[PDB]
Design a binder for this molecule. Structure first.
Ligand SMILES: Nc1ncnc2c1ncn2[C@@H]1O[C@H](COP(=O)(O)OP(=O)(O)OP(=O)(O)O)[C@@H](O)[C@H]1O
Ligand SMILES: [K+]
Ligand SMILES: [K+]
Ligand SMILES: [Mg+2]
Ligand SMILES: [Mg+2]
Ligand SMILES: [Mg+2]
Ligand SMILES: [Mg+2]
Ligand SMILES: [Mg+2]
Ligand SMILES: [Mg+2]
Ligand SMILES: [Mg+2]
Ligand SMILES: [Mg+2]
Ligand SMILES: [Mg+2]
Lengths: 48, 74, 117, 176, 134, 55, 301
RNA sequence: UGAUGGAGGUAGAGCACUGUUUGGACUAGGGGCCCAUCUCGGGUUACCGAAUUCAGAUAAACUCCGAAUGCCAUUCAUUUA
RNA sequence: GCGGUCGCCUCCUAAAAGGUAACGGAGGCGCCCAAAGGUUCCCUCAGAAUGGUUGGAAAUCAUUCGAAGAGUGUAAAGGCAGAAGGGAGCUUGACUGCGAGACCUACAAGUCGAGCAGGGACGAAAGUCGGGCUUAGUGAUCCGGUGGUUCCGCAUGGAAGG
RNA sequence: GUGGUGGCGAUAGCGAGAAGGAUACACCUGUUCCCAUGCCGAACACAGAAGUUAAGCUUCUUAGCGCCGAUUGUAGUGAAGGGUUUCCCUUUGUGAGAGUAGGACGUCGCCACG
RNA sequence: UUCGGAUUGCAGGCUGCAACUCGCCUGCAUGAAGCCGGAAUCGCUAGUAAUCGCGGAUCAGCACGCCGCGGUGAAUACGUUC
RNA sequence: CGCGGGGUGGAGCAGUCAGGUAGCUCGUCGGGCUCAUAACCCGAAGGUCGUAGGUUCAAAUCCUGCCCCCGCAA
C-alpha cells in the first residue's frame, strides 16, 4: 500500500529521486518540481 | 517478559566551560532542548548543540530556570 | 465582557518577531510604533541598547493629513537622518503589525529614499 | 436603528440617573448577540444541519458558522471534528434590528408568551435566552419547517451585573 | 490492609538506615507507640495489634494507624532454583524506620492506653516504647 | 459583509393592522403582521355547572 | 470452457481434501506434543521430593532424570516441527477459489395484486409503429419475460411506462397509485463518482449497498475506486446492487445478465426463484427465462 | 593538590505535579424504611460515599528543591615525571 | 531440557559526567504523513462555575475562572505556550555535488554539522528551508534484475559480456 | 511628566484600593476606499476627531497571594578509623532541604515631545 | 377513499328514587384496525341458499340474541372411487 | 499463577480460517386434526454470538483486555 517510488524527469527520462507514497491517499501518479542535475534546472518529475 | 534495553547513547556535555574549541564541534548532545542555543551556537535535528566558530565555551542561565550555551571568540 | 488590548497583542507578536530579528551597529533595527492617530519610528542598536535616529508625525515637519502619507513622510525623514548618521543597511522590525498599510507605505518610502533592508 | 437611537437618547439618561455613573462610558452596551442551534441528529444525517443553516440565513441575512466537536462521545456515536450545529454573531445595526424584531414581533407570537425569566443571567451581566419552539415570525416559511429544534440566543453586554443588564433590557423592550 | 491499586506490581526491598522523616511525634491521639528500631511491618501484624488494642479498650476511644503497607514483597516456591525471573508477590509491607509513631490512641484513660500499647508491642517485631502528647 | 454568500437583506416594514403600528427594519417592502408588543396583553367548572343548571 | 470447468473442479476438490488432511494431522500432532510435554514435566518433578513427608529427597542422578525428561521433550519438539511443516504446506492452498455467497432482496409488497396493466399498446416513432399491439399484466409474485429481437422496442416500452418516451404512443399502460419501482437499465453510463456519493444521490444505505456488492463478488479493495475506473462488469454490479438495495414492489430488469459472471447468473437465478417477487424481465439468455418464468411474451413488428 | 568556572538531579529533604494513603468537616451521588405512588418530593441509620478542604504520611521507574564526592576544562599556580 | 530470549528504541537498576551486568523491573518498534513537510501570517489549551431548549452527568453557545494540570501521528523519557501545539494562504528544500570539524567507536557502521557552489520555494525584507519534536521503523557481502553512462571491449570494427 | 524601546534570575509579578489625561496613549464614530472577517468592519485594515478617560494605561498605598532569602542547628556525606557489621558510632572537613529573621509593590539605560 | 365505522372528547334526550362502577338513543368532532383472510372447517337441493327489512315474548328503560313474519331470489346434484 | 480447548435463543451445533449484518435440528408457546393424547399441519416467541473497548462503511468473526467452564499442572 505504502510503496517506495522512483520519480523520473519527464524530459531526460532519468530517475533522479527516491520517495514514498500511499496508493489510497495518493492514487494519481505523483508529480513534483525537482532538480535534474543532468539538466541543472528544475523540472516536472513524474512517478514511474 | 522484561529482559531488554537499548544502546545507551552518550548524551550530556562534551565541551567544558572555559574551553577553547574548533568550529563545528559538539558541546552538548541531548534529547529535547534541556539547554538552549545561544551566541555562535546552532542546533541540530536531534537537538544537539554545536559551535559555529571558534572560541571559549560559556554556559549561562537564560534568566531564571533555563540554560544557555555561548561561544565568545578571541 | 472584556476585550483584548491591541497593544498587548502587538507586544506578543512583537516578541515573536524579536526572537529572530535584532539590531546591531552594522545592521540596526528600524522599530515601528503605531497609534490610532500618529506613528513613531526609531532606529536602534540592540547591542548597546541605544538608538541612532528617530522620526514621527509629531515633529512639525510633515505634510499630509492622511495617516499613510504621514507614514511615508516619516519614512523619508528617518531615512534622511539615518544617511546623515552614517548607515544604509538596517533590519525592519514591524513592531508586531502587518506590512500592509501605514507600515508598508513607510518602509517603501525609506527603501526608495535609500536604505537597504 | 430606532433601537440604537433609543439607546442613545432615552435609555442612557434614564440609566445614568439611577445607576449614578460619573462618566457615560460606564454605560451598559450590547456588544453582540449570538445565535446557536445544536442538532446532534446531524450525526445521523446532517441534511437537517443544512436546514438549520438555511433557517439561520433566512432569519438573519447572515451565513452561520458550523460548530464542530473537540471530542468524541461514544454515547451519541459522536466523533471529534463532526458538525454539531451552527451559530451566528450579530454586531451593530444588524444586531439592534434583530433584537427589535424579537421584541416587536416574535416574542408575542409564541403561543403562551406571558413573559420570560428574570434569573437567566450568568452573574456577570450577560443574558441567555432560549427558543424551545421555532416558527415565531412569518418569514420562518412555515411551508418547509420540517422540525422545530429551538435556539440558544445569547445577548452579551458591557454590563457589570445582573441589575445593569436587567434594567438595560427593560428600557430596551424585553418584557421580563 | 492492602492498597487497592498499584502502578508497579514489583518493587525494591529498599534500605532502612536513618531515622524517619515524619510520623515522628504524636499528633492526633494522646498516646502513641514509638519505634526504637527500624524494621518491616506487615498487614497481619498491623491487624493483630489493632484488634488487640480495640478489644482491651472495649471499643472505647479511638485508634489511628499512621503507617500503611505500600510496598510488596515476593518469594519463590520451595523447590525453585534461583533465576528465571522474579518471584510472585506474597503480601504487603510497610518499612517503618526508628523514631516513627505507628499507633496513636485517645479517648481512653492512661493506664488502659499503656496496656493496650504494651499488647500491640508484644504483637509487633519492633522494640517499641510509649510516647505522650503535650 | 462578504459577497455571494449572504442572503439579500433589505429594509422592509412590519405592520400591525390590529393597531396600525408601523416599524422599519431589515429582512429578506410592507409585510403582514398579526400581533406585536403594541397589541399583546402582557405588554371554569363551578361557573359552568352553574350556567348549565342555574343556582 | 467445459474442460476448464471440469479441471478447475478437480483442482478445488484436491485443494480442499489436502487442506482437511493437513488440519486433521496438525491437530493430532499438537495434542501428542502437549501430552509428551506434560510427561516430561512429571518426570522433572521426580528430581524433587515433598516437604510435607520426610525422606522424599536426597535424590541422586538428577542429571539422568533431567536427561530422560529432555529426550521426551525432544520428541514433543520433533512432533511440533512436523506440524509446522504441515502448516507450511497448508499455506500454499485455497488461493484459486471464489467462496461463493448468496444474495438478498428488499422486496416490499402491498395489497396491489395488479401492479401493471397494458392494453392494446402499439408503440413506435413517427408512426412507424414498432410492434403489433399487445395487452398483458404484471401481478404480485409474478415474473414476466418480455422478449424479441434487437431494436424490437423493449427499452422503448420501459420508457413509455416511466413516461420518458420521445416517440409516438397509442394504447394504454397503467401502473398502480403510489407504486415504487426498482430499475436496472440497459444504459447505465450515467453513473459517476465515488460510491459514498452515488449512494447519496440515490437514497440508499451505504452498508447494505457495499454488502450486496461484495456478495455479488466485488472485492473491498474496489470501493475506494471511482465508477469511471471500474470495469463494465463492476459498474453493472453497482447498478444491480442499487436495485437490490432499493425497497420496492416491482422490479424492472433490462438485461442484468450481460456483463456478469456465471457465478452471478447462478446467484440471480437462485435468489429470484427463492423469493419469487413481482418482476418485469428482459433477456436473451433464454435458458434463464426458462428456469424462472412461464409467462413469456414476444413482441414483434 | 590548590584556586576558578561549568555540566549533571544522586543521598537527603519535600508534596509544588504523577501515583499510594490515614483521620476529621461538608457533600454530589448510591442504598433501603415510610408517607405519598403517575413512583412521585422527602427524612432519617451519626448507612456507603465522588469531589473540595484542614491536618498527617509515602515512593526505584514522583521532584518545588538539592549536597558531599566524583567528572570536564583553564597560552592559571605548586610539586613530580 | 521446556518456557523465555537473540535485532532496534525509551525509562529504572545505573551509585547527580559518560559507561556499567543479571533468566532484574516496566513498555514499545519492524511504521506512518503528499500534509501530520517547508515558508509567511494569525491564534492558544484542559477542565470547573454560571445560564441556556430538545439535551442527558456530559455534545453545541456565551462570560469568568483559568500556567498548562492540554496537545505534541505512533511507546516511555526529555522538551516545547517567545511555541516543536492549533488554523489559513503559497508551494515541494522529503533538492543536486559536497563538507571543515566534532561526538560515539575494536572494526564495520552510526550521529551532528556551520559553510561553499548550482538551481529554487516562501516571504516586502531580514532570513528559514538538505523532511516530521528528539531519540526505534531495520540488515553486510555474494548473487541476480531495471534505467542511464563521455568507461572497457582478447589482431581490427562491432557484438557478446563486464 | 507622558509615550516608545531595550538589559538585569518577578526582590520587577498577581490581587485590592486612590487619583489623572496638559501633550500623549487609549478607548471612541464609521466602512468611503488598500485589506479582512470557514458568520460578523468584534479581531485585521483604512479614515476621522463629536465625546469619555469609565476601562485599559500611568503614578501612589497595600506584605493578602506569589518571588527572593540569610544566620544558627540538623540530616546527608568525602577522608581517617572503631564496633556488638542487612546497621550504628567517633575525629576532621563540607553542608543541604524544611522552618524562619528579613527583603521586596523595581532597577539600569537610550530616544521623541512637553 | 365521501370506504369502514371502532375508540375517544363535548353537548343533549328518554326511562326510572337513581344511568360512576353499569343503560339505550341522538348531534357535533376525531376517524383506529380492516383492501376478502393460514392450517383447517360450517350450512344448504327451492321459494331453498343468499340478502332485505317488519313485528312480538321478556321489558319502568335496554339485545348484533330468540321466536315468528313476509319482500327479492340463484347455482348445482355427472355419480358413490373415496 | 501459567499452558491448551471452550462461552452462539431452553439443549446440542455450524458459521470464526476467508468481516457482508444469525442460522440447522430438537424443544417451548398458540391454533388446527383427533372422542382424547402422541405423531402430523399452520403460526409465533426466544440470542446484537460471555463481557468493556478499538479497527472498519459494516464485527459473532480481526485486535486488545476483563469475567466464567473442562483438562493438566497447581
Ligand atoms: N430516437 C429514436 N428515433 C428513431 N428510432 C429510434 C429511436 N430510439 C430508438 N429507435 C429505434 O427503435 C428500435 C428499438 O429501440 P429500443 O431502444 O426500444 O430497442 P431494444 O428493444 O432495447 O433493443 P435491443 O435488444 O437491441 O436492446 C430500433 O430500431 C431503434 O433504432
Ligand atoms: K516486640
Ligand atoms: K322492548
Ligand atoms: Mg530530524
Ligand atoms: Mg434493449
Ligand atoms: Mg530517597
Ligand atoms: Mg551517570
Ligand atoms: Mg575485438
Ligand atoms: Mg578475437
Ligand atoms: Mg536554606
Ligand atoms: Mg334434503
Ligand atoms: Mg402444540
Amino acid at each position: 500500500m505504502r510503496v517506495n517510488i522512483t520519480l523520473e524527469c519527464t524530459s531526460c527520462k532519468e530517475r533522479n529521486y527516491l520517495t514514498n507514497k500511499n496508493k489510497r491517499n495518493n492514487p494519481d501518479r505523483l508529480e513534483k518540481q525537482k532538480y535534474c542535475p543532468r539538466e541543472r534546472k528544475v523540472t516536472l518529475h513524474r512517478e514511474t | 517478559s522484561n529482559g531488554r534495553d537499548s544502546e545507551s547513547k552518550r548524551l550530556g556535555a562534551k565541551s567544558a566551560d572555559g574551553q577553547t574549541v574548533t568550529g563545528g564541534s559538539i558541546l552538548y548532545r541531548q534529547r529535547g532542548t534541556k539547554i538552549y542555543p545561544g551566541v555562535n551556537v546552532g542546533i541540530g535535528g536531534d537537538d544537539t548543540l554545536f559551535a559555529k566558530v571558534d572560541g571559549v565555551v560559556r554556559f549561562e542561565r537564560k534568566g531564571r530556570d533555563k540554560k544557555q550555551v555561548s561561544v565568545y571568540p578571541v | 465582557i472584556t476585550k483584548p488590548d491591541k497593544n498587548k497583542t502587538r507586544q506578543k507578536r512583537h516578541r515573536r518577531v524579536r526572537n529572530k530579528i535584532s539590531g546591531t551597529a552594522e545592521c540596526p533595527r528600524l522599530n515601528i510604533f503605531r497609534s490610532n492617530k500618529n506613528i513613531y519610528a526609531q532606529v536602534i542598536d540592540d547591542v548597546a541598547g541605544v538608538t541612532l535616529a528617530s522620526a514621527s508625525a509629531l515633529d512639525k515637519e510633515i505634510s499630509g493629513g492622511t495617516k499613510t502619507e504621514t507614514a511615508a513622510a516619516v519614512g523619508k525623514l528617518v531615512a534622511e537622518r539615518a544617511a546623515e548618521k552614517g548607515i544604509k543597511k538596517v533590519v525592519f522590525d514591524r513592531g508586531g503589525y502587518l506590512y500592509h498599510g501605514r507600515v508598508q507605505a513607510l518602509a517603501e518610502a525609506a527603501r526608495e529614499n535609500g536604505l537597504e533592508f | 436603528n430606532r433601537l440604537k437611537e433609543k439607546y442613545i437618547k432615552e435609555v442612557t439618561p434614564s440609566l445614568v440617573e439611577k445607576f449614578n455613573y460619573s462618566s457615560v462610558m460606564q454605560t451598559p452596551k450590547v456588544d453582540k448577540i449570538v445565535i446557536n442551534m445544536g442538532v446532534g441528529d446531524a450525526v445521523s444525517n446532517a441534511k437537517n444541519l443544512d436546514k438549520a443553516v438555511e433557517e439561520l440565513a433566512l432569519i438573519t441575512g447572515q451565513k452561520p458558522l458550523i460548530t464542530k466537536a473537540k471530542k468524541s462521545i461514544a454515547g451519541f456515536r459522536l466523533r471529534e471534528g463532526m458538525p454539531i450545529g451552527a451559530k451566528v454573531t450579530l454586531r451593530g445595526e444588524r444586531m439592534y434590528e434583530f433584537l427589535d424584531k424579537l421584541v416587536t414581533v416574535s416574542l408575542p407570537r409564541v403561543r403562551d408568551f406571558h413573559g420570560v425569566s428574570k434569573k437567566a443571567f450568568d452573574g456577570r451581566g450577560n443574558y441567555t435566552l432560549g427558543i424551545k419552539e421555532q416558527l415565531i415570525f412569518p418569514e420562518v416559511d412555515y411551508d418547509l419547517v420540517d422540525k422545530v429544534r429551538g435556539m440558544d440566543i445569547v445577548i452579551v453586554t458591557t454590563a457589570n451585573t445582573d441589575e445593569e443588564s436587567r434594567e438595560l433590557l427593560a428600557q430596551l423592550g424585553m418584557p421580563f | 490492609l492492602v492498597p487497592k491499586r498499584v502502578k508497579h506490581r514489583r518493587e525494591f526491598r529498599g534500605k532502612m538506615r536513618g531515622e524517619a522523616k515524619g510520623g515522628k511525634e504524636v499528633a492526633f491521639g494522646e498516646w502513641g507507640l514509638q519505634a526504637t528500631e527500624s524494621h518491616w511491618i506487615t498487614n497481619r501484624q498491623i491487624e493483630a495489634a489493632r484488634i488487640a488494642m480495640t478489644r482491651y479498650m472495649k471499643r472505647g476511644g479511638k485508634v489511628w494507624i499512621k503507617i500503611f503497607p505500600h510496598k510488596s514483597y515476593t518469594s519463590k516456591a520451595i523447590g525453585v532454583r534461583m533465576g528465571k525471573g522474579k518471584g510472585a508477590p506474597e503480601g504487603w509491607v510497610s518499612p517503618v524506620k526508628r523514631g516513627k509513631i505507628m499507633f496513636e490512641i485517645a479517648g481512653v484513660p492512661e493506664e488502659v492506653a499503656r496496656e493496650a500499647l504494651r499488647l500491640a508491642s508484644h504483637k509487633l517485631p519492633v522494640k517499641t516504647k510509649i510516647v505522650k502528647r503535650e | 459583509m462578504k459577497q455571494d454568500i449572504h442572503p439579500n437583506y433589505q429594509p422592509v416594514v412590519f405592520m400591525d393592522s390590529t393597531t396600525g403600528f408601523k416599524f422599519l427594519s431589515g429582512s429578506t417592502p410592507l409585510l403582514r403582521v398579526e400581533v406585536t408588543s403594541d397589541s399583546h396583553p402582557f405588554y371554569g367548572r363551578v361557573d359552568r355547572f352553574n350556567k348549565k343548571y342555574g343556582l | 470452457f467445459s474442460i476448464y470447468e471440469e479441471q478447475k473442479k478437480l483442482r478445488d476438490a484436491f485443494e480442499l481434501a489436502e487442506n482437511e488432511k493437513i488440519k486433521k494431522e496438525v491437530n493430532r500432532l499438537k495434542e501428542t506434543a502437549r501430552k509428551k510435554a506434560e510427561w516430561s514435566m512429571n518426570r522433572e518433578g521426580d528430581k524433587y521430593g515433598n516437604a510435607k513427608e520426610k525422606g522424599s529427597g536426597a535424590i541422586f542422578d538428577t542429571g539422568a532424570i533431567g536427561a530422560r525428561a529432555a529426550r521426551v521433550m525432544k520428541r514433543s519438539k520433533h512432533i511440533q516441527q512436523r506440524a509446522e511443516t504441515q502448516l507450511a504446506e497448508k499455506e500454499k492452498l485455497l488461493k484459486d477459489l471464489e467462496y461463493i455467497d448468496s444474495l438478498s432482496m428488499d422486496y416490499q409488497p402491498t395489497h396491489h395484486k395488479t401492479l401493471l396493466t397494458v392494453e392494446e399498446l402499439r408503440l413506435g416513432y413517427e408512426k412507424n409503429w414498432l410492434f403489433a399491439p399487445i395487452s398483458f399484466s404484471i401481478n404480485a409474485g409474478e415474473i414476466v419475460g418480455i422478449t424479441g429481437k434487437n431494436g424490437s422496442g423493449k427499452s422503448s416500452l420501459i420508457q413509455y411506462l416511466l413516461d420518458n418516451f420521445s416517440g409516438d404512443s397509442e394504447g394504454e399502460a397503467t401502473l398502480a397509485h403510489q407504486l415504487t419501482i426498482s430499475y436496472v437499465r440497459q444504459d447505465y453510463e450515467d453513473n459517476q463518482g465515488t460510491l459514498s456519493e452515488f449512494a447519496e444521490k440515490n437514497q440508499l444505505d451505504y452498508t447494505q449497498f457495499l454488502n450486496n456488492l461484495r456478495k455479488l463478488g466485488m472485492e473491498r479493495a474496489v470501493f475506494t475506486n471511482r465508477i469511471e475506473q471500474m470495469s463494465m462488469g463492476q459498474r453493472k454490479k453497482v447498478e444491480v446492487a442499487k436495485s437490490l438495495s432499493q425497497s420496492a414492489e416491482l422490479y424492472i430488469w433490462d438485461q442484468p445478465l450481460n456483463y456478469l459472471d456465471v457465478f452471478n447468473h447462478q446467484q440471480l437465478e437462485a435468489l429470484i426463484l427463492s423469493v419469487k417477487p413481482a418482476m418485469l424481465v428482459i433477456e436473451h439468455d433464454a435458458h434463464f427465462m426458462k428456469k424462472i418464468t412461464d409467462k413469456k411474451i414476444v413482441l414483434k413488428s
